[PDB]
Structure formats: structure tokens, C-alpha cells
Amino acid sequence: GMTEYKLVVVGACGVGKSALTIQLIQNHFVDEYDPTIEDSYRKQVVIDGETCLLDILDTAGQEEYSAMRDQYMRTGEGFLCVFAINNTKSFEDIHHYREQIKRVKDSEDVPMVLVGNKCDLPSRTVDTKQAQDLARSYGIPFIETSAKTRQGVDDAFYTLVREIRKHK
């Protein structure tokens, strides 16, 4: 039987968490904004020779529901931390999501990947350099993505699977 990985996508509202997830699952791009309550996805893939089953939880980034996120963070093995490169606020929230993850998991060593999404847009307020420096500080990979063009999507999720594999 194929091994199962439990991924959790986190980040502020509107950054493209669901659009990235839907692009990975369905090869489809959601051009409309359907804010997430909570959705779980299943997908089988072959990564580095190992066939595996990805269980992906797509979460809501609303601040009022922080206490609920704790349960997402207990069960999840790895965390895709998404901000939008035209949204400086969502970039600043990353620090808070990471802190919460670190706390709930009681560990500085939790598989994680920083994702700067919407890299197709001509406007940009978060430089690649800033996000590199932040990821380097945290000790985690950094990938720039565009769910609109499909750029970097597979890399982001598979890199996270690899970080869990390395961690386990």
C-alpha cells in the first residue's frame, strides 16, 4: 500500500491557498474568490520513485478562528505557508502562522515551505530577496508560484513531501 502524507496549506485570506491546491488536484484554475470553510483532498503521485497518497487540508486564514487552526496543526505533518507577492500584509502574517505551528507542535523542527504566490502579477510589493532572506532565517525552502499559470505548483507540494520525508 502507498504511503500517506498529511499536508496543510495555511496563510491569509485571498493569497491563493485554494487556487494552488485546486491546481494540484484538478489542473484547474479558480479565477473567482470562493473563501474556504474547510476542504480535504486526496491525490496519488510518484515522488522520487516512491508512490504516495497526499492528504491535503485547505484551511481558512481568518484571525477569529485561530483556536480552531490548532487542531489542523496537531494532525498535520507538513505546512505550506502561502503569502501573495502583491500583499505585504499576508507576508507579515507568515511570522504568526509559523509561530503558531511551532507552538502547537512543540518543536522548532516542523516540515515547512514558504510560498510566494501570484508571481504572474506585474505589481509586486514583496521582493523575492525579502522572502529568500526570511526563508533562509527559518531554515526552509522558498518557492515563488502562480496558480494562474501553474508555475511552481508541483514543486511547492512535492518539496514539502520531501521535507517531511527528510524529517521522518
Binding site: 485570506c13 473567482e32 474568490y33 470562493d34 473563501p35 470553510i37 474547510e38 476542504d39 477569529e64
Partner: protein, 163 residues
């Protein structure tokens, strides 16, 4: 005076019953008028034929997207969005009628009906009415909801207007 409107609710096309609402035009006239006009269709568009796309038992029933019928659309009689009129009224218990939104000042046509106290929404969603008659119909709609709101049968506003 506060006007009253009704939805005639259907389940997979089978008539379920009538819900009526009192609209608090005396505290939120702009928001009440919008919902009133969308219930009569007098502006050429409105809730007739739209569905309740999100029903989460123990919390609320949400609907009002008549432009896209997928939970992302809707529009007000004032344009695509209008401002938060105020937050005088609160989500005190079952029957409260309040505006859905996607951040401050993004009210359109989407609305929700509380089935319980949802006080963490106070100050963020504009309450503008309450169920007058037919709360039992709202409870029945919860029969077809789920934890994440996806419905198991198509709940529609088969008819609606002003009383």
C-alpha cells in the same frame, strides 16, 4: 415601518415551506431596502430562483448568489458592493438575518440566517432583520447541511416577495 418579505423554500424542487422576515429599516434602512428590492425583483434581478449554497448545522444557512449561483457572486441594487451601514444589531440567537461579506464594505446580495448565537461575527457582519414566521423551515434546511456547509440536496428560493 419595517417591511416584511418571504421566501418560499424548495428542496430538490419539492416545496418545503415559507419563511418570512422583518427587515429593520428603522436601524439599517439602506441594507433593509436592498434585501427588500431583491426579494420582490422589482429592479429586474434578485433572489427568486437562487439557492442556499452553504448550510452548516448549528450555525447558519447562507444564500443570495443569483449572479453566479456558486457562492462567489451576487450584487446589490446600489452596484457590486456597498458599505457596512452600521453594526448596531448583533447576532444574538436563532433567526437573525445578516449580510455576508468578504471584508469591510463588501456587502452585495449574499446573506445568512443564524440558527444559533454567533457572537464572534458581531462588528463584522451587518445584521438587518430576523425571521418572523417559519423558523421551523430554517431548522428543516439544516437537515441538508454539513460541517463545511456543502448541501446534500439543492435548497432553492422557489418564490419570494413582499407582504
Amino acid at each position: 415601518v419595517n417591511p416584511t418579505v418571504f421566501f418560499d423554500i424548495a428542496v430538490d424542487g419539492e416545496p418545503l415551506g415559507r419563511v418570512s422576515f422583518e427587515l429593520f429599516a428603522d436601524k439599517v434602512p439602506k441594507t433593509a431596502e436592498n434585501f427588500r428590492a431583491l426579494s420582490t425583483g422589482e429592479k429586474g434581478f434578485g433572489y427568486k430562483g437562487s439557492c442556499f449554497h452553504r448550510i452548516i448545522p448549528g450555525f447558519m444557512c447562507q444564500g443570495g448568489d443569483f449572479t453566479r449561483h456558486n457562492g462567489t457572486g451576487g450584487k446589490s441594487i446600489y452596484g457590486e458592493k456597498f458599505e457596512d451601514e452600521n453594526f448596531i444589531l448583533k447576532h444574538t440567537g436563532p433567526g437573525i438575518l445578516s449580510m455576508a461579506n468578504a471584508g469591510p464594505n463588501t456587502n452585495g446580495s449574499q446573506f445568512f440566517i443564524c440558527t444559533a448565537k454567533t457572537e464572534w461575527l458581531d462588528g463584522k457582519h451587518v445584521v438587518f432583520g430576523k425571521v418572523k414566521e417559519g423558523m421551523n423551515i430554517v431548522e428543516a434546511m439544516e437537515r441538508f447541511g454539513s460541517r463545511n456547509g456543502k448541501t446534500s440536496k439543492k435548497i432553492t428560493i422557489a418564490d419570494c416577495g413582499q407582504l
